[PDB]
Design an enzyme around this catalytic site. Structure first.
Site, PDB file in Angstrom:
ATOM      1  CG  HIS B  54      -1.789   1.178   1.431  1.00  0.00           C
ATOM      2  ND1 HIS B  54      -2.844   1.331   0.556  1.00  0.00           N
ATOM      3  CD2 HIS B  54      -1.870   2.176   2.356  1.00  0.00           C
ATOM      4  CE1 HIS B  54      -3.547   2.390   0.951  1.00  0.00           C
ATOM      5  NE2 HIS B  54      -2.978   2.932   2.008  1.00  0.00           N
ATOM      6  CD  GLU B  71      -3.646   5.287   4.659  1.00  0.00           C
ATOM      7  OE1 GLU B  71      -4.181   5.606   5.726  1.00  0.00           O
ATOM      8  OE2 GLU B  71      -4.169   4.709   3.692  1.00  0.00           O
ATOM      9  CD  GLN B 115      -7.221   3.625  -2.213  1.00  0.00           C
ATOM     10  OE1 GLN B 115      -7.024   2.359  -2.354  1.00  0.00           O
ATOM     11  NE2 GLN B 115      -6.304   4.444  -2.025  1.00  0.00           N
ATOM     12  CB  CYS B 122      -3.144   3.545  -2.436  1.00  0.00           C
ATOM     13  SG  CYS B 122      -2.211   2.014  -3.102  1.00  0.00           S
TER      14      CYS B 122
HETATM   15  C1  LIG Z   1      -3.452   0.957  -3.484  1.00  0.00           C
HETATM   16  N1  LIG Z   1      -4.659   1.177  -3.210  1.00  0.00           N
HETATM   17  C2  LIG Z   1      -3.019  -0.415  -3.591  1.00  0.00           C
HETATM   18  N2  LIG Z   1      -1.678  -0.705  -3.804  1.00  0.00           N
HETATM   19  C3  LIG Z   1      -1.269  -1.989  -4.029  1.00  0.00           C
HETATM   20  C4  LIG Z   1      -2.263  -3.022  -4.034  1.00  0.00           C
HETATM   21  C5  LIG Z   1      -1.933  -4.531  -4.173  1.00  0.00           C
HETATM   22  O1  LIG Z   1      -2.887  -5.307  -4.480  1.00  0.00           O
HETATM   23  N3  LIG Z   1      -0.658  -4.948  -3.802  1.00  0.00           N
HETATM   24  C6  LIG Z   1      -0.221  -6.366  -3.804  1.00  0.00           C
HETATM   25  C7  LIG Z   1      -0.381  -7.056  -2.401  1.00  0.00           C
HETATM   26  C8  LIG Z   1       0.580  -8.031  -1.954  1.00  0.00           C
HETATM   27  C9  LIG Z   1       0.443  -8.663  -0.679  1.00  0.00           C
HETATM   28  C10 LIG Z   1      -0.660  -8.327   0.167  1.00  0.00           C
HETATM   29  C11 LIG Z   1      -1.611  -7.357  -0.257  1.00  0.00           C
HETATM   30  C12 LIG Z   1      -1.475  -6.744  -1.530  1.00  0.00           C
HETATM   31  C13 LIG Z   1      -3.626  -2.687  -3.848  1.00  0.00           C
HETATM   32  N4  LIG Z   1      -4.022  -1.374  -3.635  1.00  0.00           N
END
Ligand SMILES: *C(=N)c1ncc(C(=O)NCc2ccccc2)cn1
Lengths: 11, 204
Positions: B54, B71, B115, B122
């Site tokens: 995130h 954030e 959001q 994000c």
């Molecule tokens: C922003 N809202 C945001 N950023 C990244 C993700 C995402 O799905 N990241 C991958 C992940 C890996 C391990 C655990 C949870 C998410 C989603 N939203």
């Protein structure tokens, strides 16, 4: 926009 | 899915943040060493060994000694630790010691969500907040021409019907803002819209 909080921090 | 580091670096440069942007970091971002210059960074909640979870934005105004934390869900410090295992006391302490003669800073942190709870936008919201900080570094969270385009809501109300039109509109305005201001986003508009969509994370 967004509301926010302000905090004074002393180190 | 979500946004990669390369994506966010290209967009922040398009938005004119390049003179103050330190880069993208994982949770180990060390803080600001910038007693005389504006600075900002995009910082993940996780370590690089995870690939990213995130995105948050941190910014620093040396003349007001203010560290901003945007954030996109506006979680309390307790919820950031509960949901994302993320704490940022060390980087605040480093920033105050390196960048303020009195070792004191003001932390100004968003308390509202922009959001939706299933969105993957994000990192893009952080890029929009950094356009506001690069242009209005005394009032980046609200009351400026960028952040006035989107509206925060209490994070406790995210799953309630009375806020759904606002959260939908916020993500539509984020994409329209990036169409106007980022040739990178324009050239990648469909791909990034699909990877970051409002219900990209919705349970099935
Ligand atoms: C922003 N809202 C945001 N950023 C990244 C993700 C995402 O799905 N990241 C991958 C992940 C890996 C391990 C655990 C949870 C998410 C989603 N939203």
């Amino acid at each position: 926009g967004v509301q926010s909080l302000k905090r004074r921090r002393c180190f | 899915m979500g946004s990669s580091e390369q994506e966010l670096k290209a967009i922040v440069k398009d938005l004119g943040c390049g003179p103050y942007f330190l880069g993208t970091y994982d949770k180990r971002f060390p803080g600001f060493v910038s007693p005389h210059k504006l600075a900002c960074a995009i910082v993940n909640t996780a370590g690089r060994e995870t690939g990213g979870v995130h995105w948050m934005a941190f910014a620093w105004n040396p003349r007001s000694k203010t560290c901003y934390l945007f954030e996109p869900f506006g979680f309390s410090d307790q919820r950031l630790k509960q949901v994302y295992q993320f704490e940022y006391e060390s980087l605040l302490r480093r920033s105050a010691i390196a960048s303020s003669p009195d070792r004191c800073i003001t932390l100004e942190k968003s308390t509202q969500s922009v959001q939706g709870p299933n969105s993957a936008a994000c990192g893009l919201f952080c890029c929009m907040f950094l356009h506001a900080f690069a242009n209005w570094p005394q009032t980046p969270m609200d009351h400026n021409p960028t952040m006035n385009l989107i509206t925060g809501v209490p994070n406790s109300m995210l799953n309630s019907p009375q806020v759904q039109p606002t959260l939908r509109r916020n993500q539509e305005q984020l994409y329209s803002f990036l169409e106007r201001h980022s040739p990178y986003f324009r050239s990648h508009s469909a791909q990034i819209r699909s990877a970051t969509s409002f219900c990209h994370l919705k349970n099935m």
